Design an enzyme around this catalytic site. Structure first.
Site, PDB file in Angstrom:
ATOM      1  N   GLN A  20       0.778  -1.548  -0.092  1.00  0.00           N
ATOM      2  CA  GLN A  20      -0.242  -0.148   0.081  1.00  0.00           C
ATOM      3  C   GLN A  20       0.769   1.127  -0.493  1.00  0.00           C
ATOM      4  OE1 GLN A  20      -2.042  -1.605   3.973  1.00  0.00           O
ATOM      5  NE2 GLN A  20      -2.082   0.542   4.430  1.00  0.00           N
ATOM      6  N   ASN A 183      -1.900  -9.808   3.906  1.00  0.00           N
ATOM      7  CA  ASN A 183      -1.253  -8.249   4.396  1.00  0.00           C
ATOM      8  C   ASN A 183      -1.067  -7.617   2.641  1.00  0.00           C
ATOM      9  OD1 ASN A 183      -1.527  -5.878   5.985  1.00  0.00           O
ATOM     10  ND2 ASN A 183       0.243  -6.399   7.572  1.00  0.00           N
TER      11      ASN A 183
HETATM   12  C1  LIG Z   1      -5.543   1.175   7.054  1.00  0.00           C
HETATM   13  C2  LIG Z   1      -6.067   1.925   7.384  1.00  0.00           C
HETATM   14  N1  LIG Z   1      -7.128   1.296   7.680  1.00  0.00           N
HETATM   15  C3  LIG Z   1      -8.716   1.666   7.369  1.00  0.00           C
HETATM   16  O1  LIG Z   1      -8.179   1.945   6.662  1.00  0.00           O
HETATM   17  C4  LIG Z   1      -9.548   1.053   9.024  1.00  0.00           C
HETATM   18  C5  LIG Z   1      -9.737  -0.357   8.123  1.00  0.00           C
HETATM   19  C6  LIG Z   1     -10.955  -0.735   9.192  1.00  0.00           C
HETATM   20  C7  LIG Z   1     -11.520  -2.004   7.950  1.00  0.00           C
HETATM   21  C8  LIG Z   1     -10.698  -1.044  10.568  1.00  0.00           C
HETATM   22  N2  LIG Z   1     -11.084   2.270   8.612  1.00  0.00           N
HETATM   23  C9  LIG Z   1     -10.997   3.268   8.723  1.00  0.00           C
HETATM   24  O2  LIG Z   1      -9.710   3.591  10.434  1.00  0.00           O
HETATM   25  O3  LIG Z   1     -11.279   4.168   8.857  1.00  0.00           O
HETATM   26  C10 LIG Z   1     -11.908   5.552   9.125  1.00  0.00           C
HETATM   27  C11 LIG Z   1     -13.194   5.767   8.455  1.00  0.00           C
HETATM   28  C12 LIG Z   1     -11.070   6.708   9.352  1.00  0.00           C
HETATM   29  C13 LIG Z   1     -12.439   6.289  10.651  1.00  0.00           C
HETATM   30  C14 LIG Z   1      -4.605  -0.085   7.502  1.00  0.00           C
HETATM   31  C15 LIG Z   1      -3.115   0.382   8.042  1.00  0.00           C
HETATM   32  O4  LIG Z   1      -2.561   0.398   7.391  1.00  0.00           O
HETATM   33  N3  LIG Z   1      -2.217   1.345   8.667  1.00  0.00           N
HETATM   34  C16 LIG Z   1      -3.249   1.752  10.100  1.00  0.00           C
HETATM   35  C17 LIG Z   1      -2.866   0.973  11.171  1.00  0.00           C
HETATM   36  C18 LIG Z   1      -2.466   2.099  12.689  1.00  0.00           C
HETATM   37  C19 LIG Z   1      -1.884   1.964  13.946  1.00  0.00           C
HETATM   38  C20 LIG Z   1      -0.808  -0.187  13.715  1.00  0.00           C
HETATM   39  C21 LIG Z   1      -0.797  -0.679  12.232  1.00  0.00           C
HETATM   40  C22 LIG Z   1      -1.605  -0.181  11.034  1.00  0.00           C
HETATM   41  C23 LIG Z   1      -1.611   1.763   8.922  1.00  0.00           C
HETATM   42  C24 LIG Z   1      -0.603   2.967   7.770  1.00  0.00           C
HETATM   43  C25 LIG Z   1      -1.404   4.121   8.061  1.00  0.00           C
HETATM   44  C26 LIG Z   1      -1.080   5.235   6.719  1.00  0.00           C
HETATM   45  C27 LIG Z   1      -0.009   4.223   5.912  1.00  0.00           C
HETATM   46  C28 LIG Z   1       0.153   3.261   5.523  1.00  0.00           C
HETATM   47  C29 LIG Z   1      -0.109   2.189   7.066  1.00  0.00           C
END
Ligand SMILES: *[C@@H](CNC(=O)[C@H](CC(C)C)NC(=O)OC(C)(C)C)CC(=O)N(Cc1ccccc1)Cc1ccccc1
Length: 216
Positions: A20, A183
């Site tokens: 990603q 992943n």
């Molecule tokens: C991908 C980002 N997460 C989401 O889109 C979540 C997914 C749900 C199914 C939980 N949704 C979400 O937050 O949507 C709203 C509408 C914004 C509330 C996950 C990801 O790769 N990352 C998040 C993360 C945070 C903490 C620890 C590990 C992973 C990491 C990431 C963020 C930004 C860039 C690259 C990687």
């Protein structure tokens, strides 16, 4: 009973692990993984579908700021299609929607949710349907450094879902039950981009709290 182990990688339902990059597009990779499964099952074709199509065009999601798989499946339904990766390549930054009907590679006739917290139903859905989109707490250092074995951390928070991945199967490694998880953090994260996550240990990391799959 569904089989004791299922691995959709062995049956050619799963595309290579993606990266990603610096974009919260996990939800878009999860969504295309589940659509790629149904497409292999229904057409016999394995091909990369377009996460960028979803990042840029799912207006109910927040692009690189995050999203839900259900929202994505509804968009592919309304839009009457999703492009191939080839027709709408990944950039890893949010751009204005450039959906091109010419490049359409799959459709979606809706989706279903697994009953919340129900790992038995998630197991049956994976066996019956194919790869299932799931949400987990991936916040723990133990998650980020995973190498091998069946991942369990009692500090995992099933009420803190922050990452979207793909359940492509399940099994039992030396008596430890697991989910086989694709992943989207590249081929060199975890075990070649995969993690085995504990199964039937009280919904560990909330694996069955937000699971869904598309109809096709
Ligand atoms: C991908 C980002 N997460 C989401 O889109 C979540 C997914 C749900 C199914 C939980 N949704 C979400 O937050 O949507 C709203 C509408 C914004 C509330 C996950 C990801 O790769 N990352 C998040 C993360 C945070 C903490 C620890 C590990 C992973 C990491 C990431 C963020 C930004 C860039 C690259 C990687």
């Amino acid at each position: 009973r569904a089989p004791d182990s299922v691995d959709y990688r062995k049956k050619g339902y799963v595309t290579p692990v993606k990266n990603q990059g610096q974009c919260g597009s996990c939800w878009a990779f999860s969504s295309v993984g589940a659509l790629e499964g149904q497409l292999k099952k229904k057409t016999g074709k394995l091909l990369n579908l377009s996460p960028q199509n979803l990042v840029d065009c799912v207006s109910e999601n927040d692009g690189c700021g995050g999203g839900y798989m259900t929202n994505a499946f509804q968009y592919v339904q309304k839009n009457r299609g999703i492009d191939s990766e080839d027709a709408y390549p990944y950039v890893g930054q949010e751009e204005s929607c450039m959906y091109n009907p010419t490049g359409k590679a799959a459709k979606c006739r809706g989706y279903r949710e697994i009953p919340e917290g129900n790992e038995k139903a998630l197991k049956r859905a994976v066996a019956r349907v194919g790869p299932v989109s799931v949400a987990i707490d991936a916040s723990l250092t133990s998650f980020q450094f995973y190498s091998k074995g069946v991942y369990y951390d009692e500090s995992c928070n099933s009420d803190n879902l922050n990452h979207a991945v793909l359940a492509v199967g399940y099994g039992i490694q030396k008596g430890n039950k697991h989910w086989i998880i694709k992943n989207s953090w590249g081929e060199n994260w975890g075990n070649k981009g995969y993690i085995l996550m504990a199964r039937n240990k009280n919904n560990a990391c909330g694996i069955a709290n937000l699971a869904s799959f598309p109809k096709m």
